[PDB]
Amino acid sequence: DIVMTQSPDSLAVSLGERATINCKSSQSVLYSSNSKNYLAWYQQKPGQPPKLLIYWASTRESGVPDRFSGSGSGTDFTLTISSLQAEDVAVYYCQQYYSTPYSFGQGTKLEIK
Amino acid sequence: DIVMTQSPDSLAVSLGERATINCKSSQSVLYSSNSKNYLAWYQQKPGQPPKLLIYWASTRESGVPDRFSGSGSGTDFTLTISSLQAEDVAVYYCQQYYSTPYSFGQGTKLEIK
C-alpha cells in the first residue's frame, strides 16, 4: 500500500507563531491526467472526531481559515498553520486517497507551549 | 533591535525523518548590496557549547553534512534536517548578525521520539 510518513511526531508552538507539518507518501499520489494530488489533511481536536481541513493537497474545506495552508506535490506535502491560536491544538493527519486502501499517516500532535 | 522568532519551540521527531525549524527576523537581514542574508544557525547539543552550522543563511560550515540545509531570505528562514540521527538531538538557534546587537532567537528544542 502507499505509506504515509508524518514529521514531526509532535511539536510545542507559541501563539501567533507558525506550525509546519510534513507528510510524504511512499509513492506519488499525483494523478498524471488531471494533475491533482490525492492528499487530504485532517484536524482531530482533543476528544473529537477527525475533521477534513484540506483535500487535493491544497484545497480548503468550506469554513477553513486561510491560516491553514496545504502545499506540496507528488510525494512531498506540507500543512502550514500560521498565527497559531488556542483552538488549533489537535493531532493532524495526512491521508493519501490515491489508491485503495486510502492510508493515514501516524499523526502530528500539536500542543501550545 | 532586530527580533528573531523561532518556531516551533520544540519538536519530537523519529529517526530517518525530517525536522523543519522556522526563524523570522523583525526586519530584513538581507544586505541589498551583496544580496547575502546575515543569518546564522547554531546547534547546541546537550551540555555543550553552541556550534555554528550555517551562516549567510545557507552556507554550511566545513564538516557540516548536507542533511542540514539552511534556506530562506530577507525575513523568512528555515533550517531543514533530513534523515534525523541520534546525534542530532540539540537546541537550534538562529541569529541575525545584520546589525548590532546581533540577536539570537529563543531556540528550538529537538528531541528524538
From Swiss-Prot, chains A, B:
Region spans: Framework-3: 63-94
Residue ranges, annotated region (Complementarity-determining-2):
56-62
Spell out the residue ranges making up region: Complementarity-determining-3: 95-101
Query: Quick check: keyword Secreted in the entry?
Result: yes
Q: Where in the cell is it found?
A: Secreted; Cell membrane
**Cysteines engaged in disulfide bonds, as pairs:** C23-C94
Region named Complementarity-determining-1: 24-40
**Name by which UniProt lists this protein:** Immunoglobulin kappa variable 4-1
What organism, scientifically named, is this protein from?
A: Homo sapiens (Human)
Q: Which gene encodes it?
A: IGKV4-1
Q: Could you say which residues of the full protein are shown? A: 21 to 121 of 121
